[PDB]
Amino acid sequence: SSFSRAPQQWATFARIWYLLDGKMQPPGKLAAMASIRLQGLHKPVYHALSDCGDHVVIM
């Protein structure tokens, strides 16, 4: 992408903020989605030792 090395690293590992609406939703299905996002398991760069979790906001 022809980015500079430091900006490229910053973008790849950047934290994203996700919004989830909980109205009339079962907690487990909300929990299952939040679990994946909080661990970074939704990213192709995922590694347990990489702190690649994302922010999850549930209303």
């Binding site: 992408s1 973008a11 790849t12 990213k43």
Partner: protein, 150 residues
Amino acid sequence: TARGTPSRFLASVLHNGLGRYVQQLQRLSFSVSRDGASSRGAREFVEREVIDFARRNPGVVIYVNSRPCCVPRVVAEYLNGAVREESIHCKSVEEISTLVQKLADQSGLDVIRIRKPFHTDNPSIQGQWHPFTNKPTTFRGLRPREVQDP
């Protein structure tokens, strides 16, 4: 071990092979006894194998020093400054021939754990993944639950 030893990444010396191939081995120093059972193989190697090897590898300078020694050795020096000393004690000519050719083909980098069996300076052609790589854009870049014309 891995935890108890050092490691490095797969590498080359001066991008060897990209433009041309350069043999990293530059010097071999042999210490051989005129008398000494342990030097019998080294003496035979010098008689019938060293000359042919020298012609095959003109880039390598070979020093053969005949002197009293209990343990004959070959010191291999590489372009990157690496120095690798090996023992040819009681080795046959075939075994010494194998070791010497092995030194000729090595790069001189430390023979330690290599983390990855591949190295690239250009891992991506289409752009490294980031969190927005597969996210669609929205009209006026509005955020979730954001109001236009505030």
